[PDB]
Write a protein that binds this ligand. Structure first.
Ligand SMILES: [Cl-]
Ligand code: NA
Length: 129
């Protein structure tokens, strides 16, 4: 599913992301934009052989099991395929564990490089939340 901006804001807000560990909804929408372009089916192979999955490009190195990341944990206790669903519960519940791990949203390289310190509220402008 390729989500609309405001649709994904609504979904993330309903799944408790809004101000989750102090991160405003627009931070999350900004991260999803540059990670996946709002596409739940996005996958990207990392040089190390891990893969990033779904709207927030959650990495098989740590967070989900894809059966082909040697030496990897599944800290979210899910198959990585669950992170490509139209329904973002699995992605959102895993992102909560991630952002609580103590680097906050720095865990998302695209959030650190492209969203951090920017007017992120522009990502939720004109959305009925
Ligand atoms: Cl933080
Ligand atoms: Na894994």
């Amino acid at each position: 599913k390729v989500f609309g901006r405001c649709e994904l804001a609504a979904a993330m807000k309903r799944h408790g992301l809004d101000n989750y560990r102090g991160y405003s909804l627009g931070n999350w929408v900004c991260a999803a934009k540059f990670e996946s372009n709002f596409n739940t089916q996005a996958t990207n192979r990392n040089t190390d052989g891990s893969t990033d999955y779904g709207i927030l490009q959650i990495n098989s190195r740590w967070w989900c099991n894809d059966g082909r990341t040697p030496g990897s944990r599944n800290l979210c206790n899910i198959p990585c395929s669950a992170l490509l669903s139209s329904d973002i519960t699995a992605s959102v519940n895993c992102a909560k564990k991630i952002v609580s791990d103590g680097n906050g949203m720095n865990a998302w390289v695209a959030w650190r490089n492209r969203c951090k310190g920017t007017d992120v509220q522009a990502w939720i402008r004109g959305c009925r939340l």
